[model samples]
Target: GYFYNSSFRRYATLMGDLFSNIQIKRQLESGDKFIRVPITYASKEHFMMKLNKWTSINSQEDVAKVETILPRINLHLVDFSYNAPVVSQYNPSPIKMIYELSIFTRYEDDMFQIVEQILPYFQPHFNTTMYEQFGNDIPFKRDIKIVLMSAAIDEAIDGRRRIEWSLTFEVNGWMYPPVDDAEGLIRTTYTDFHANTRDLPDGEGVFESVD
Candidate 1:
């Protein structure tokens, strides 16, 4: 059987969804704790535009009508590269893509709320699973690695009142096109390689055995 209905671009979306799914819980000053899910997915530029728009809402009418989550967590595909120029020898159109993941946040508390929960898993790397659009899990595995961290708490909140925090990672993932051929099963011998000698020629029939 042959399957080749997928492309590599969907991977970025998948990666973004991975961070969006991270659950961040914080305890409020009122002595109550709640789970916050503001870590939504957005590209690098669009989210910034939204934040700009969010800050400049001057009229009460606009403010009252404006509706969106605060402490917005934006996940974007910064860039990506191949692990090597050559594709995987054992895989179909395979490439180990090093995807750069960018996470952005505005609120100080939300920044830590999201970053802390994520970093521990990375001890410096965490595993995540992805599925193809149709069916079947992706053949290659991935580890999210924390590669950079930056914080800017000053500068008049950067004219957007965003306390601005970022966490970056090099996501090692496999980019494989539709798999045209894959082995259905594999066999192994036990105890340092021993094969039947055809029962010394007494029995040489009726089996899936390869002599």
Candidate 2:
């Protein structure tokens, strides 16, 4: 009973990756430059606290400083509920996982850029097909349904005018049981066809076999 397929871990990572490479442009006097926002696995409160601890720096060459780290994305797996409608005793059990994708930006235009990049993919839902690894050569194909639950914005830290956009999503996922390794595993099947010869003989009949 020590088997683990890391199904939940995979789901979490896959969900985060959906919004991994969002880019926003910075309008400058010289020209415009596109900046790729960084994403991290953390809660909104924790991310804000970490941001608050950083000292103010005015270097234009630093990458991870507070200035460059602004307009970031944070992902968190919030909930997991059993999907009763598709529950099974012998096969995989279905579950609904809720994931939150939070974006932190110092400018309103930056938040709008990230939101527009996301809303187009979900007309409320997106389809993600994952290859599940089983104890066989052919990987199992599973279709995960991702739905956009809600989107909300907040004015975080009044003085800094920091903005946070929280988008909730529901992922329909499955949890599989351990595969049986014992013998007698069904590899093939046979079907038999019998034709009654009542007109020719009462007790004799022709039989056909297919495997």
Candidate 3:
């Protein structure tokens, strides 16, 4: 017997409403389908600009009014389930499952900028003992990149100019697989975006994916 869960239906309705919203649709159409959502400082510049503009009302009450009109942009969390039917010597578990949550951002630069600003402000809250939990005294370092797929533009019902950016992250580890003994372990990583080295435009450039 198959039973339909009301909770699932409610959730589907909520998601559908979000997608159909004018602001969300505009954002989805503004950027490529596969924009790189990197976790770096450069990504947050665009959002910060908007925030700054909203905060410039000159009066505290006026500033508070801005918050009411702004949409809270963030990643959506959902549970994913999967089952594997086959098992082998190398992979013993036939139905191995693990739960993990990923934080996704519409604009990679916005996230990176916020992290850079907030990390330093909260660093002093941790003591020496608490710092040891990180394993190394230094902070965790990582570089991320994304490849954008498509982009478009949409006009909202209220006539607001909303830029919709879509993106996905590309994951690559810093370490390389062990090869011959002569070479041993190797460290290989992607390079940073430099104006002199790469041909990417400084601003308002088209996004493309590499094979």
Candidate 4:
């Protein structure tokens, strides 16, 4: 909780690849496929809420034209929920996180283009995996989706045409938690039976007198 590293960036860089891509043309056609889309983690409170700027305005270009770049995805972490964490136990990162991925586009057709491609992986089974911050032994895995691939065109900003149609996917998964070092890996700390076990004869094993 105290440190943020290349891990988050690594996460943002990779999660998009988790989903395949596709796209279309300007006219009356459901064009083609985009196996890869420009996927990246959304900056915290990214873009202004009122007049969100995916790109800044300059004299050379109208900021309103930002709408031209549709079909991109923004992955934002919404919240974290810990199942039941214990200090003395090595548990799956008790922290279960919720990630909301928004696919933005100007056309509903172009928007749905990315949705159908994303649904097949969910085919009534939800087991997707993610790597740990550093180790292969520890990774995040489990149900990666929540519900129907839904959409909405929010014309929240003024002028009207500066609106975007977006599809959202909220994914849930467990965190790779820490090992409770207090519970030493080897549990037999008592020396009372050490001699019997270490120096045992063929028939004499480590056991209590009555045992």
Candidate 5:
């Protein structure tokens, strides 16, 4: 009998192998560094207007064009931590691990390109509450943007590895032109790595080896 699995399960399995590597595991376990970022954009009215018009046209090329024109946003760095098992319960030894952080944004034509790239690997999760707030049924007046954030953690034992990850998408904003006097959307994503090492004492004393 064939049964269907949730998108989460399927996507996780698909990316599991890459996430589980020795270098990745060691860095995540040591907790050297991590990253956090936020995306900002123009007013909701402007977004709504542009979004409505783009959706109405329903052309991939048109959407790509708008996406190219949108502003390039900066991503802020945030802290992260390791939360994986170091040694196996059955056997204790060196283990391999990996970690990843990703984000997705959807806005009329611009978002279509994003989805097209992410859909093959990850699943789409929409925020209905946000959609209602900015989405409209007017031509060149309805605009909605969705941003997705994701993180992956991987661990390996005896050359074998395992991984876990999470995904989240939120409504960033909307556009409506005159009704919303704001600039275009700016989105950012970033990741940081950390490593474990012996802490050395700081000293200004000159050292000489005595035989």
Candidate 6:
């Protein structure tokens, strides 16, 4: 029970990275400006509730209304399910995980701009390679397939609208059971160095095995 694999954490971070570099342009009175969207690891409900509370964690306890962080992407890991048809008791199993990417924007066009930046890349699925697994011969790697499942719109407070998109991904991830000391590995080896071996020793011959 001492094992805490960060497979899900890796998946979440990968998803966040996909939307981290998104930018939207706005025409200001001064000139056109660009806004690089900030993605947060929060659910829609959690983020919306914070808007009512004071954004305060300062030394003086001074408070201010939670400022609008619109044109922001909220990421949430919605679910995880058994995905592998066949299972080996001692092998890594396949898992299906779902992530919701909710986009918040003030203008309809802003939402559209954000959506366009994301949708084109995922023709339905995108593959990401994560070096999360420990290596045997070489460093272990897995290609995580993120499939865009669905998208929808939701009402919002003030003038912000939510464009929520759901993506499902399967990780060829391994879930390793604990290794007891009994089944521990061999770190060192000792062999008999016969100065003059008559012939190749038989199976049970000269050398003794060491662990």
User: Which candidate ranks first by lDDT, i.e. highest?
Assistant: 2
**Candidate 4's residue-wise lDDT over 1-211, tens digit each?**
2123222332333344454234454453566433344554554355334124444466456656665544566666565565553553234444344556666655566655676666555444344443232232343333333433455556544443334545454434344533343432211111011112111111112111111
Sliding window of 10 residues with minimal summed lDDT for model 2: 202-211
Of the candidates shown, which would achieve the greatest TM-score relative to the real structure? 2
Candidate 4: residue 130 lDDT (0-100): 38
What TM-score do all the candidates reach, one by one?
A: 0.56, 0.72, 0.22, 0.51, 0.19, 0.64
lDDT score for candidate 1 against the true structure: 0.44
- Candidate 5, superposed: residue stretches over 4 Å from native: 1-76, 86-107, 123-211
Cα deviation of 37, candidate 5, in Å: 18
Please give the distance, in angstroms, between residue 142's alpha carbon in candidate 2 and its true position after superposition: 0.7
Where is model 1 poorest over a 10-residue stretch in terms of lDDT? 199-208
| Candidate 1 C-alpha lDDT tens digits along 74-113 | 5555666666636643253333434434444445666677
How big is the positional error of residue 152 in model 2, measured in Å on the Cα after superposition? 1.4
TM-score of 4: 0.51
Candidate no. 5 TM-score: 0.19
lDDT (Cα) of model 4: 0.42
Q: Deviation in angstroms for 76 in model 2?
A: 0.3
Candidate 1's displacement at residue 105, Å, is 4.5
Per-structure clash totals for the candidates: 2, 0, 16, 3, 25, 0
Tens-digit lDDT track of model 3 for 80-132: 22233253321221221111112223344443443343234222321110000
Candidate 2 lDDT score at position 208: 9
Which scores greater on TM-score, model 3 or model 6?
A: 6
Better of 1 and 2 by lDDT: 2
Off by over 4 Å in 3: 1-64, 67-145, 159-161, 172-211
Give lDDT per model, in order. Answer: 0.44, 0.64, 0.27, 0.42, 0.26, 0.54
- Stretches off by above 4 angstroms in model 1 are 1-6, 23-35, 39-42, 64-68, 85-90, 93-106, 129-160, 177-211
Error at 148, model 3, angstroms: 2.6
lDDT of 2 by residue, 1-211 (tens): 3122345545655665555546898999999999987777665577667766542444554435656658788778888899877655325778899988888889898988989888877778877665543444454556678899999878856557588889999989777653453522212111111111111111111110110
